[PDB]
Design a protein around this ligand. Sequence first.
Ligand SMILES: CCCCC/C=C\C/C=C\CCCCCCCC(=O)O[C@H](COC(=O)CCCCCCCCCCCCCCC)COP(=O)([O-])OCC[N+](C)(C)C
Ligand SMILES: CCCCC/C=C\C/C=C\CCCCCCCC(=O)O[C@H](COC(=O)CCCCCCCCCCCCCCC)COP(=O)([O-])OCC[N+](C)(C)C
Ligand SMILES: CC(C)CCC[C@@H](C)[C@H]1CC[C@H]2[C@@H]3CC=C4C[C@@H](O)CC[C@]4(C)[C@H]3CC[C@]12C
Ligand SMILES: CC(C)CCC[C@@H](C)[C@H]1CC[C@H]2[C@@H]3CC=C4C[C@@H](O)CC[C@]4(C)[C@H]3CC[C@]12C
Lengths: 377, 377
Amino acid sequence: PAPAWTTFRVGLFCGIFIVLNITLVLAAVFIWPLIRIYRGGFLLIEFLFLLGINTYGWRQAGVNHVLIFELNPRSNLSHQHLFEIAGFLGILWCLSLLACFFAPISVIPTYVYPLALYGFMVFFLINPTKTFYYKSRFWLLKLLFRVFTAPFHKVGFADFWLADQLNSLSVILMDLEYMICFYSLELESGICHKYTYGVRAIVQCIPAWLRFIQCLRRYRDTKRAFPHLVNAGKYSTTFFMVTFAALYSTHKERGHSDTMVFFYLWIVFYIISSCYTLIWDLKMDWGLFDKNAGENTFLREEIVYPQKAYYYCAIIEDVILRFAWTIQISITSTTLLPHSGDIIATVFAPLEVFRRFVWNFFRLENEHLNNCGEFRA
Amino acid sequence: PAPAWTTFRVGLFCGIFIVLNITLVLAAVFIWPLIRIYRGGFLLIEFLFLLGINTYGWRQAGVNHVLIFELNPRSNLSHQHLFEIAGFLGILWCLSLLACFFAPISVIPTYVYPLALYGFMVFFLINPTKTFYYKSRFWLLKLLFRVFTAPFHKVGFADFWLADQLNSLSVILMDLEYMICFYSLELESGICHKYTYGVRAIVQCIPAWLRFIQCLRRYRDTKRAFPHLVNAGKYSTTFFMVTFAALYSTHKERGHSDTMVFFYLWIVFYIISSCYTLIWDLKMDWGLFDKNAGENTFLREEIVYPQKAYYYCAIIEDVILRFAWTIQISITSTTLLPHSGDIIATVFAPLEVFRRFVWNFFRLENEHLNNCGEFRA
Ligand SMILES: CCCCC/C=C\C/C=C\CCCCCCCC(=O)O[C@H](COC(=O)CCCCCCCCCCCCCCC)COP(=O)([O-])OCC[N+](C)(C)C
Ligand SMILES: CCCCC/C=C\C/C=C\CCCCCCCC(=O)O[C@H](COC(=O)CCCCCCCCCCCCCCC)COP(=O)([O-])OCC[N+](C)(C)C
Ligand SMILES: CC(C)CCC[C@@H](C)[C@H]1CC[C@H]2[C@@H]3CC=C4C[C@@H](O)CC[C@]4(C)[C@H]3CC[C@]12C
Ligand SMILES: CC(C)CCC[C@@H](C)[C@H]1CC[C@H]2[C@@H]3CC=C4C[C@@H](O)CC[C@]4(C)[C@H]3CC[C@]12C
């Protein structure tokens, strides 16, 4: 059981966060792209909350997520701790947004509030002192370093899972790159969003690149072509989508008679990527639609979770949100729809986070039931 | 141990209450005497919070408050439950005050909000359904009924303790009387606050009358003059103070050439009442300044609380706040200081509540250590 003080802190943070959200909504209804700046922080807070929910559900369902992630049996971060961290970060995020909205102090400008929020987040993650979740934070930092140096390090379940999360959090990297461009040029006024370039596509594909190189490393280590090269192609579909969209946009800016062929290539490879990722998540990562399953239709014969309706709704939402996520990657990597691109990305990113949350649920359950990832011996 | 959900609710209520207080302060810095209307609710919430703290401290110190109050051992109200109730009531109070400040709904008039808040509080206290700590609420209702009908019922420790709480919460009754007068006449400008009447003075003396009649009944039952008649005189001192203050102000309104005589008599009786109450609290209720104590100076021989500095600070604060409370009674019951009387009473009432909180601490401690109250055989 979590400490009573931990529960009190979680409740206090949740209440303050709720009232801060209400105040922000009231201020909204009653110089900087604040939406893009704060999208990353909001997505991180939502991901932390959904991670706490994932931990609670795994504990309730009996899934041995601790063993899969190779976490210390003696000390395990509770879902309440994740909720507390998410609530505190959300409170700080809301306070920064309110300060931007109202500008309480004339001497203090607006950019310093988001700058301090993100800087405090980074410092808290890498806080040298052993004060607030130091063990878990150091483990997460090691995992992040391993994931980024994917080819050099052997791929474990934790590395692959974190790389998948990054794939679901590419919006943060996109927003950071856009902010860098805005500072470099804007601060034509809208040159950054008016024109798309290759480095933007590279930043979009970075998570997929990490996953693809991890798959190549796993193929080299295990020498099994089917389990790993197919996943590598699944991740390469994303690169093909991104570069084809970028070419289509570039030739839209200046027609070379190849705009239409690039449009067709982008559409076909977008459909291919959506189908590939959806099928991999539905069959390989989840294990559903198993032949052995006779009691549960379209599911696997053993289902740890209580309701099959959970699995069915997960399938439907996974399909819809996979198509939505590929659409969002296309919109964010390249201009495409300029006027509504930012709005589409903002609406879609939380949906992608929720989809990855459900996917984490079901993938961890399947891995507990069967060694789908083959990480274990 | 309190339920985890109870702790989460306590934290959520505390956070919402804190943010609502911040919003109220910011609105204040940026027809109805709202101060008088809401002082009673604020004092009630503060008393509930301090009572929860008292219960926690009694549990920590080993004081058998359950046995002293003759409460059911199996079923008890944890300090966390009191904190939750206080937080919810404070949230409702803050929402009502904010609604009054902003008048969010044009159709709804201002007077509805405080009326709705107080009606909801009363209904919650007298809720017939078996919900929201129904057993404790019924016990409290029975205790209040017995306390008000003091002479007819034999005095127990709980009755005397609740009567003392009422003595420390006479400001609520004073505010209710002032509101009744305001509705009767105002709804001459400021007629009620400009002048004082005998009914106001009588209302000021209601808790003291209850305590005095309880002491008389205890004297009749026990037949011991010293333990009860001395306390009866202690409670008569406040009657004399209030009566002489009212008489002096009445003579000030209509000169009789004896106003100075009444002023001197009121001052003398105020000093008498302050000294009587302070001496009774320090020597009898707390049992300090005992000759038996060899290792403790100015304190009783046996102390359960970890620090004697607590006892010394309690002595000092009681000394100051008894005079402060007598001044508050004199100012509120009468028109002694019409210009600043309301502010003085508003500042002093929380101080009186805090004094009663410390007094509850030490009185329960002394009763557990020694049967000073003589309520046990
Ligand atoms: C694109 C931008 C960045 C995207 C987001 C990046 C990273 C976050 C993603 C995942 C975090 C890990 C979630 C848990 C997964 C394993 C299951 C589990 O629940 O295991 C947890 C692992 O706890 C964790 O790892 C910590 C959870 C996350 C805490 C968040 C820290 C603050 C971050 C601030 C923002 C940072 C970025 C700056 C702002 C831009 C069990 O904890 P333990 O203490 O037993 O850990 C093991 C420790 N031993 C082995 C020594 C005992
Ligand atoms: C102007 C007048 C304002 C209203 C009156 C003032 C104060 C009311 C609050 C508290 C006084 C009683 C404190 C007793 C302490 C004993 C030690 C202990 O803490 O032990 C607790 C006492 O619990 C209580 O009785 C409840 C304490 C109060 C809880 C809050 C209820 C709502 C109050 C709302 C007031 C609304 C007023 C509106 C304006 C008029 C043990 O709990 P149990 O569950 O064993 O209770 C006994 C139940 N058996 C016997 C069946 C086991
Ligand atoms: C609104 C629709 C489209 C979204 C898809 C349905 C959502 C609500 C479903 C998909 C998977 C479901 C989760 C699957 C497993 C668990 C673990 C269990 O111990 C508690 C419920 C919980 C946490 C479920 C909550 C509901 C859930 C998140
Ligand atoms: C006004 C100045 C000079 C003195 C103020 C002293 C106050 C703050 C002192 C007087 C009695 C003290 C309390 C006495 C007993 C306890 C119980 C213990 O388990 C926790 C601390 C607690 C609750 C103390 C907190 C501090 C306290 C309330």
